[PDB]
Amino acid sequence: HMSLDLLVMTAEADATAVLPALDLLPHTVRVRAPEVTALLDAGHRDVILLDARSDLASAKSLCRMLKGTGEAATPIIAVVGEGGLVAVSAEWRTDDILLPTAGPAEVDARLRMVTT
Amino acid sequence: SHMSLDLLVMTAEADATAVLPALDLLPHTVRVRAPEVTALLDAGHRDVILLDARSDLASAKSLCRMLKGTGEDEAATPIIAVVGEGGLVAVSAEWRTDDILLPTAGPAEVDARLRMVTT
Numbered sequence: 001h002m003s004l005d006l007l008v009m010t011a012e013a014d015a016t017a018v019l020p021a022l023d024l025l026p027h028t029v030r031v032r033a034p035e036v037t038a039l040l041d042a043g044h045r046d047v048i049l050l051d052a053r054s055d056l057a058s059a060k061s062l063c064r065m066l067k068g069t070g071e072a073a074t075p076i077i078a079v080v081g082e083g084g085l086v087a088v089s090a091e092w093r094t095d096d097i098l099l100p101t102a103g104p105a106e107v108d109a110r111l112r113m114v115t116t
Numbered sequence: 117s118h119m120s121l122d123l124l125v126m127t128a129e130a131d132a133t134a135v136l137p138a139l140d141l142l143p144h145t146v147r148v149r150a151p152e153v154t155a156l157l158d159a160g161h162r163d164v165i166l167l168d169a170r171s172d173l174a175s176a177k178s179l180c181r182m183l184k185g186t187g188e189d190e191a192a193t194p195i196i197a198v199v200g201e202g203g204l205v206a207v208s209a210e211w212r213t214d215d216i217l218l219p220t221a222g223p224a225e226v227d228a229r230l231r232m233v234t235t
Contacts, residue, residue, distance in 0.1 A: 085224040090235045097232075099225065106218065109204040113216075116209045 010051035067093035126151040127168035141223040184212035
């Protein structure tokens with residue numbers, strides 16, 4: 001699986017504001033709003049990137065929801081500013097975290113590891 | 117939990133400041149021992165172990181596999197590999213690391229990562 005299908009949950013038009021390095025990787029990126037409704041039928045996804053730069057509480061509870069739905073096993077990486085790093089805990093149930101300034105090598109490493 | 121963590125940095129270097137400078141800005145206590153198994157024999161508590169993997173990826177990899185062994189004990193001490201930008205392409209699940217860090221990571225990220233891995 002060279003390319004992965006990533007769902008970026010964000011109030012933004014594209015992921016380049018959230019994670020710029022994604023633009024330099026071979027993975028295919030689609031964007032949806034950070035709402036349960038938005039996620040109803042995106043289709044396939046290998047990883048969910050959760051945009052958590054601005055509204056940490058929303059992201060936390062959104063994340064808590066997705067993990068514990070009891071059917072969910074899809075990994076979630078939270079993209080956190082420098083910023084809300086102190087706000088990230090095990091309660092989020094994230095599988096990993098990324099700073100928006102992360103370069104391509106680290107983004108790819110973390111996506112691969114969270115799928116393997 | 118506790119504020120200050122006991123960190124064991126396995127490196128062939130004199131001080132951890134070479135490996136992760138951000139550690140200088142954090143309240144955690146740092147011990148340095150050579151990257152060999154005899155390191156774990158060191159008395160003294162350790163919350164986490166930082167494996168210096170900046171120069172010799174294969175040595176670090178086999179050392180990590182050895183120490184971790186096939187999983188697993190929930191009870192084991194966690195290992196975070198400090199890796200350069202070059203050989204990030206080389207870290208995989210085979211290492212059995214608990215997290216990864218670039219040597220240029222700032223204090224907030226180092227702190228966040230160390231705390232997540234003790235949970």
